[PDB]
Amino acid sequence: PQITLWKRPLVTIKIGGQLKEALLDTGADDTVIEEMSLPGRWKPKMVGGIGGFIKVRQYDQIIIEIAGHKAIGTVLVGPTPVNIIGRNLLTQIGATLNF
Amino acid sequence: PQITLWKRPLVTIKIGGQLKEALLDTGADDTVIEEMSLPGRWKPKMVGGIGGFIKVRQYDQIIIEIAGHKAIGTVLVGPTPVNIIGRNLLTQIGATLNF
């Protein structure tokens, strides 16, 4: 699809068999999801945004569907204002910015 | 152009007579630039994201050139870690996300 930017680019994702809403975010290096349970071990990470840095849990090789497109990759879990699909998964679903 | 998302989508902008580098950010409602002077009136605003909120000055009806495309809109000025071009100006240059 072609997504214009007059509204927030919110899509449905599926992770852990559950549907959630998330923002397609070209300004984000990484994908950051609200507190949830994921399988496996995690590693520590800090990520920085407009108001400062937050600690997150890094889970690798997580199966996630984004607007119907399958991806398998790193998901960070922590106190984000909105679920964010960042470039690590936007590249897996073949997203580009065009103008 | 078509911009892939393997790396951060950084472009050159011209704002207030100055050249700056900025990130094309579909996850941002607003355009936020590091400290600089701009003409006309302003009013204070708080804008948030990961890590919390920052205080900015809001200037309306500012002309910017984004990778050679002129647009007019609101620009927020304050201590952002990255210059970001948000949806309020991405729409005006006809930017879309495609996959």
Binding site: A28, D29, M46, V47, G49, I50 | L23, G27, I50
Partner: peptide, 4 residues
């Protein structure tokens, strides 16, 4: 890492 930058999330913005």
């Amino acid at each position: 890492d930058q999330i913005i």
